[PDB]
């Protein structure tokens, strides 16, 4: 069930997606996702359904009732779906597939046909909606960032560095910056559109922040737009500031022992409405809850039987 202002779920390789709440770390509902693994899951902004996307299908799971089955399934693509998302009023789906495409879907059982396709020469790894719900970022395995506006049908392509695949990109809800990470850990931050009027979409490279010697897998802002957390394959999650882009906080799950040899990577993270407590998904068969100030963990959920690669954490707007 999901009749609560805050919700939390994780997904991975154990063929289940777990829902729980951060009161005592006990699971509420284990929804059965079989025949594939979940790349990414997202909850609907009306807080009625959740969506798990992995390997050629997007499965909806109901939140108000107790149903372990995929009520609505979307198929048609031929490979994986890296990331999905919805309009903030629940009108259209932006889904980035593994093969070559970033497409739109219509959520109503009617012939509206607001669905378009965007085709590039590379397998795409990340999609990100603009906070004004007008533009969209595509990030692929050739290091290219396709700024595609849904009003027109022409798209900008930007290459900071070729020969390296970029993995994630995100824009803070205050619309201040745009950061992105690649497969060597470099995190470039361009200044986004300042042209609120007619969507001119000018970008100037502000900084590149060199960290994360291993692969950097996900970078996300905060809703307060004062912090930015990024997770990397050296079993670390580091939160930086937006003032001078220095290191605010460092978190690690490393045991300090040479007998483990990277027992689990840092796959995903998310902020809260206060930007005070974060929830992190590591591949050590459990998820953690940390604070952005004291450094030490505050909570743990270890009900999974395999690694987990994606997690969803939304709460109420007040915070």
């Amino acid at each position: 069930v999901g009749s609560d202002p805050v919700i939390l779920a994780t997904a991975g390789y154990d063929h289940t997606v777990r829902f729980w709440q951060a009161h005592s770390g006990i699971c509420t509902r284990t929804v059965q996702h079989q025949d594939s693994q979940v790349n990414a899951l997202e909850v609907t902004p009306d807080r009625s359904m959740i969506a798990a996307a992995g390997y050629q299908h997007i499965r909806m799971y109901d939140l108000n009732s107790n149903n372990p089955n995929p009520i609505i399934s979307y198929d048609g693509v031929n490979k994986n779906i890296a990331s999905v998302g919805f309009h903030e009023d629940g009108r259209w789906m932006y889904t980035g597939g593994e093969d070559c495409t970033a497409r739109i879907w219509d959520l109503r059982s009617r012939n509206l046909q607001c669905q378009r396709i965007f085709q590039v020469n590379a397998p795409i790894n990340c999609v990100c909606l603009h906070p004004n719900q007008a533009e969209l970022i595509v990030g692929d395995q050739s290091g290219a960032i396709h700024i595609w506006d849904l009003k027109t049908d022409h798209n900008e392509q930007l290459i900071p560095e070729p020969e390296v695949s970029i993995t994630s990109a995100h824009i803070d809800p205050d619309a201040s910056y745009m950061a992105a990470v690649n497969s060597t850990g470099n995190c470039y931050v361009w200044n986004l559109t300042g042209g609120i009027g007619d969507e001119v979409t000018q970008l100037i490279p502000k900084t590149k922040i060199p960290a994360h010697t291993r692969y950097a897998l996900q970078c996300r802002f905060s809703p307060d737009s004062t912090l930015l957390a990024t997770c990397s394959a050296d079993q670390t999650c580091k939160i930086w500031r937006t003032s001078n882009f220095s290191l605010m906080t460092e978190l690690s799950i490393k045991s300090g022992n040479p007998g483990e040899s990277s027992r689990g990577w840092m796959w995903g993270c998310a902020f809260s409405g206060d930007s005070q407590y974060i929830v992190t998904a590591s591949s050590d068969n459990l998820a953690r809850l940390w604070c952005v100030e004291t450094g030490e963990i505050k909570r743990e959920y270890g009900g999974h039987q395999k690694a987990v690669v994606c997690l969803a954490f939304n709460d109420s707007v007040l915070g």
Binding site: N69, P70, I71, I72, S73, Y74, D75
Partner: peptide, 22 residues
């Protein structure tokens, strides 16, 4: 008669099968 049991099998599983939209 094998066809009657196969018909029973198909109707019983088809009753549970069709419950979702693709």
């Amino acid at each position: 008669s094998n066809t009657a049991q196969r018909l029973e099998r198909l109707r019983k599983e088809r009753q549970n099968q069709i419950k979702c939209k693709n």
